[PDB]
């Protein structure tokens, strides 16, 4: 999740694609009633766009996967 919002948009896109591939590979990570919303959110999100627009979406995924929101000064 920390790499999902990197300074380079290509790194963000690569991390998003790799996370999507790993979620499609392993099925014992996220539950059945949670993985659907995660896949729907990860697919309908342009990670190569305004960081303010993208960030809001990443905080969402964290809250959907039980992860504390990392913040900076």
């Amino acid at each position: 999740c920390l790499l999902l919002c990197h300074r380079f948009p290509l790194i963000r896109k690569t991390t998003a694609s790799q996370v999507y591939e790993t979620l499609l590979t392993y099925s014992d990570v996220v539950g059945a009633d949670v993985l659907d919303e995660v896949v729907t959110v990860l697919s309908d999100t342009a990670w190569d766009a305004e960081l303010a627009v993208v960030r809001e979406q990443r905080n969402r995924l964290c809250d959907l996967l039980g992860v504390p929101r990392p913040q900076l000064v």
């Binding site: 300074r7 380079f8 948009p9 290509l10 190569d48 766009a49």
Partner: protein, 431 residues
């Protein structure tokens, strides 16, 4: 006037040269009769490079046709643009070679080399300022493999202050089922490593895989590959026939692109890849064409440059575009802060813009690079070379003519040394 003499060897070489001349004649504006009919002044400012001036404003093509078999000679002469060629440059034999390097280099190949030199010597005497030569052939048969290297060494000696560039064709088992082919190919490489300034490797396996996947062809014939070969050759020789901001010739290009004399194998490319059909999809933009010409899918060789290190890169654009847009693109893409940043595209790229677009395409980009990925092809060839030298199969065919067994071991050692040098030079940084 920096004139360049062109030589054609073998059936493949003759066909490729004929198609290249056919392509460049329609671009320069020359009718089958021999006169000029273009509507631009930029089509004649460099016509003295590949043509000669005659009486009545004629432009004779500067190419020589040589073979040990006449079938190809008759096929071309009677072609659409065969009447413009000089009949004195037709030197052919009868028997041939039969896929044997010895029969084409020491036996029947040496009984015609002197006759070939006659035409060359005589053609180079009328040139006011000769720059170099050129040769198009293939590394599969016996004629273009043995007689080709022989003529190359002849030019190297008689003329050691000139330039030598070849457009070899790498054979593939998916097309030809010949068995000794690999040996002949090695014997040619053993001489091309030492007596060549620049080489453009055109892998037939890569073209077959492209025609059998991207273009989707049930049975890709020879013309389907020859079209792409001629298109790539017309895309590369644009700086030598049309001026621009990147003022260079053959000597400057060989100095800038070839830093080491032993490392000079390039990998060409062209985008977009179209078949022989007279159709078109949509006018692609500059970034799309750049991404297509820089991708490993549009590579003429079966080698991935992503696994290697780029040495010298040079791209040539053709279309109604401006240099400012190309500069802005090359400056924006190489920025990691942008969203359209890519890693599979190098940074040191020499850009060039041409006004005249290719025949049938409004915008097209040509890729020329010196990636260290030819070691994969050299290992694929060495695999076949070692999988047949252990059993000594078909080795008596060469020794029964006058060849020595030490030549094969010397060629294998040279190939191994070249592969090791490429592997050593692949890892290089500068901080």
């Amino acid at each position: 006037m920096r004139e360049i003499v062109h030589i054609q060897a073998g059936q493949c070489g003759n066909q490729i040269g004929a198609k290249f001349w056919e392509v460049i004649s329609d671009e320069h504006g020359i009718d089958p009769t021999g006169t000029y009919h273009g509507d631009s002044d930029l089509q004649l400012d460099r016509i003295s490079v590949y043509y000669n001036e005659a009486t009545g404003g004629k432009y004779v093509p500067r190419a020589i046709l040589v073979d040990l078999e006449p079938g190809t000679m008759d096929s071309v002469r009677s072609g659409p643009f065969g009447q413009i060629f000089r009949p004195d440059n037709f030197v052919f034999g009868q028997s041939g070679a039969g896929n044997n390097w010895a029969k084409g280099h020491y036996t029947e190949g040496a009984e015609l080399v002197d006759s070939v030199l006659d035409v060359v010597r005589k053609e180079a005497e009328s040139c006011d300022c000769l720059q170099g030569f050129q040769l198009t052939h293939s590394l599969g048969g016996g004629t273009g493999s043995g007689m080709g290297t022989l003529l190359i060494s002849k030019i190297r000696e008689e003329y050691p202050d000139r330039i030598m560039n070849t457009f070899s064709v790498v054979p593939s088992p998916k097309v030809s089922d010949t068995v000794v082919e690999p040996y002949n190919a090695t014997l040619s490489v053993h001489q091309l490593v030492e007596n060549t300034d620049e080489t453009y490797c055109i892998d037939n396996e890569a073209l077959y895989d492209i025609c059998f996947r991207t273009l989707k062809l049930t049975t890709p014939t020879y013309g389907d590959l020859n079209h792409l070969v001629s298109a790539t050759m017309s895309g590369v020789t644009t700086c030598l026939r049309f001026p621009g901001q990147l003022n260079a010739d053959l000597r400057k290009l060989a100095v800038n692109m070839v830093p080491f004399p032993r490392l000079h194998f390039f990998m060409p490319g062209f985008a977009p890849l179209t078949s022989r059909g007279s159709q078109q999809y949509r006018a692609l933009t500059v970034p799309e064409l750049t991404q297509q010409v820089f991708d490993a899918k549009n590579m003429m060789a079966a080698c991935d440059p992503r696994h290697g290190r780029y040495l010298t890169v040079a791209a040539v654009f053709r279309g109604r575009m401006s240099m400012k847009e190309v500069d802005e693109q090359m400056l924006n893409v190489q920025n990691k802060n942008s969203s359209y940043f890519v890693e599979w595209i190098p940074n040191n790229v020499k850009t060039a813009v041409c006004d005249i677009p290719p025949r049938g395409l409004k915008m097209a980009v040509t890729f020329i690079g010196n990636s260290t990925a030819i070691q994969e092809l050299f290992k694929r060839i060495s695999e076949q070379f070692t999988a047949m030298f252990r059993r000594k199969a078909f080795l008596h065919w060469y020794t029964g003519e006058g060849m020595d067994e030490m030549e094969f071991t010397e060629a294998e050692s040279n190939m191994n040394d070249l592969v090791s040098e490429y592997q050593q030079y692949q890892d290089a940084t500068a901080e």
